[PDB]
A paper describes a structure:
The Bcr-Abl oncoprotein is expressed from the Philadelphia (Ph) chromosome, which is formed upon the t(9;22) reciprocal chromosomal translocation that fuses the breakpoint cluster region (BCR) gene with the Abelson tyrosine kinase (ABL1). Bcr-Abl is a constitutively active tyrosine kinase and is selectively inhibited by imatinib (Gleevec), which became a paradigm for targeted cancer therapy. Due to the different translocation breakpoints, p210 contains a predicted Dbl-homology (DH) and Pleckstrin-homology (PH) tandem domain that p190 lacks. Here we provide high-resolution structures of the DH and PH domains that unravel unique structural features.
The DH domain forms a six-helix bundle arranged with a kink toward one side similar to the ‘seat-back of a chaise longue’ in line with the canonical fold of DH domains. An interesting feature that is specific to the Bcr-Abl DH domain is the extended 18-residue-long loop region between α-helices 4 and 5 covering residues 622–638, which is 10–13 residues longer than in most other DH domains. To increase the crystallization probability of the DH–PH tandem domain, we generated monobodies, synthetic binding proteins based on the fibronectin type III domain that bind to the DH–PH domain29, 30. The crystal structure of the DH domain includes the six major α-helices in accordance with the NMR structure. No electron density was observed for the extended flexible α4–α5 loop region seen in the NMR structure, so this loop was not included in the crystallographic model. Overall the comparison of the DH NMR- and crystal-structures revealed an identical overall fold with some variation in helix orientations. The monobody bound, as expected, via diversified positions in the FG loop and the βC/βD strands, to the tip of the DH domain proximal to the N-terminus. Notably, these residue that are important for GTPase interaction, catalysis, and selectivity are not conserved in the Bcr-Abl DH domain. Furthermore, the extended α4–α5 loop points directly into the GTPase binding interface, where it would sterically clash with binding of a Rho GTPase. Our structural data show that with its extended α4–α5 loop blocking the DH-GTPase interface and lack of conserved catalytic residues, the Bcr-Abl DH domain may not act as a GEF. Collectively, based on our detailed study, there is no evidence that the Bcr-Abl DH domain acts as a RhoGEF.
Author numbering:
A (entry chain B): 489 to 623, 638 to 688
B (entry chain A): 3 to 95
Amino acid sequence: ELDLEKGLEMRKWVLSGILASEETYLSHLEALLLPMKPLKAAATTSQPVLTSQQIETIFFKVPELYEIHKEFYDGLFPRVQQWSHQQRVGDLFQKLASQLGVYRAFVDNYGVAMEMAEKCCQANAQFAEISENLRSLETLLYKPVDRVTRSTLVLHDLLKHTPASHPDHPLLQDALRISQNFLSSI
Amino acid sequence: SSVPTKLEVVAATPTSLLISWDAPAVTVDLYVITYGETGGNSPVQEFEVPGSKSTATISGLKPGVDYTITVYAGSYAYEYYWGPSPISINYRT
């Protein structure tokens, strides 16, 4: 950590790991999103699988989560491909932390969404089949919960290799503070 | 030195580790990286790393869990191909 040249390499490695983790997370979000299209199509016909209300309850904020993480991933990727002491990533993490309101809504609704989805998988024929081959549904619904709980861990892991002389340091420290406050509020 | 020394974890994410060691003074033909939960809740696994490297990324790990990590070095400079003294560390993710 005291050798800033090694620290630069370690910081790139952590950022590369964050990219890989976001790729995996975006795939899980896509897996949840894909059945929404036929479900919303059938909901407005005389042969609905789930009602629009049940769809909105189960899949609440999943598109919004996908959008903010796609923005973060797409912003971070080119910076890691052009890595140097000059490179700055802090604004991307501040932007994601500014969007934690999406997670607050999702987490507040998670228990209802989980129950609603468990009911239908235990009783509804076509939806139980949908939840069986999601690129389960309840497993994927926990991914946003499990992940944001680890947000301060990854930020600390990145800060460990960011020197106080680098202008990303105050931005990452502030994103960590805001994320800690969010976890405390939950 | 003739065998890998000074194995350490030099960076981490909640589910992954970067290990690093001092490369030996031989041409390494192949590295094998071995890792598993120290307590046996999941099986030991291995993967290969080219002899031109002296670091490795281990991913897919459980957070907050003790792991044992071992590096094996194969070299045609070694009498029985695999080095006489593999090196191991423990690390809590």
